[PDB]
């Protein structure tokens, strides 16, 4: 049920993205912390237990609403992880993903009727995920996972270093 030994796969994911430790600006309005996240990924399966995968993630744009100051933060990146899986049944796997993300985060803020700025930064963060994967056909599988990414930013540059959690459904095709 894990992809056959020495096989390639490609897939995509959609998810509920939520940022945490979101300190940035002292805005007096709401912040919309739940956002659509998305990504593409591809990988290679070594054996039923071990695979490696790379992907791009869009982590979503968080608005900071307010009438004193308002702004936004967004992040995205490229990740590389090892996937370690246990065949809990002969058709369902449970897995963890371990590795890192090269990320770009962008911020903006403005004062209503006044000044504004845009900034961005780049850096590297650890990625951990856990999930289950079900093989629908020998070619198609679906994933449900939670992906945690730490310190997406720098408080000395863009002014925030939030964490991201993302629950996602993914689908992949296997080139067996």
């Amino acid at each position: 049920s894990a992809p056959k030994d020495n096989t390639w796969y490609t897939g995509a994911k959609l998810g509920w993205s939520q940022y945490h430790d979101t300190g940035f600006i002292p805005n007096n309005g709401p912040t919309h912390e739940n956002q659509l996240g998305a990504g593409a990924f591809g990988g290679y399966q070594v054996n039923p237990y071990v695979g490696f995968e790379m992907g791009y993630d869009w982590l979503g744009r968080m608005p900071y609403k307010g009438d004193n100051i308002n702004g936004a933060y967004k992040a995205q990146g490229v990740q590389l992880t090892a996937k370690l899986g246990y065949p809990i049944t002969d058709d369902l796997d449970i897995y963890t993903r371990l590795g890192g993300m090269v990320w770009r985060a962008d911020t903006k803020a403005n004062v209503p009727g006044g000044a504004s700025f845009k900034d961005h930064d780049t850096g590297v963060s650890p990625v951990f995920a856990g999930g289950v994967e079900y093989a629908i056909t020998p070619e198609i599988a679906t994933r449900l996972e939670y992906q945690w990414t730490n310190n997406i930013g720098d408080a000395h540059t863009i002014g925030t270093r939030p964490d991201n959690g993302m629950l996602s459904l993914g689908v992949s095709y296997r080139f067996a």
């Epitope: 940035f24 600006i25 004193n68 004062v111």
Partner: nanobody
């Protein structure tokens, strides 16, 4: 409508005044806060500033005559002017800087007029 100033008008030479400015949201959202002064079409002169940690700085033209302060329970920044010279008449303007990592984001008020008699 972010920084709102009050309390200018006429003062006599050698007299005294208190200006006040209340910000949208909280003092301590900013570092520093300050006062500037402008005569019609001349540059904004920095008058005084006050850091989040409460350190105070002054222009040499007002040092020892004016004093900068706040009251957190009032949410108010004050300029106390004493020993007013005729060279201190201006529109006095409240300033407030948001410090967002490496980025500085300034806020300015319309200002309040101060006029001086001999």
């Amino acid at each position: 409508r972010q920084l709102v100033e009050s309390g200018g008008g006429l003062v006599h030479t050698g007299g005294s005044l208190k200006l006040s400015c209340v910000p949208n949201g909280s003092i301590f959202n900013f570092n520093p806060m300050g006062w500037y002064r402008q005569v019609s079409g001349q540059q904004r002169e920095l008058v005084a500033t006050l850091t989040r940690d409460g350190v105070e700085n002054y222009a040499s033209s007002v040092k020892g005559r004016f004093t900068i302060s706040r009251d957190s329970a009032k949410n108010t920044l004050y300029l106390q002017m004493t020993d007013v010279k005729p060279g201190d008449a201006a529109v006095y303007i409240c300033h407030a800087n948001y410090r967002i990592g490496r980025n500085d984001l300034p806020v300015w008020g319309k200002g309040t007029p101060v006029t001086v008699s001999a």
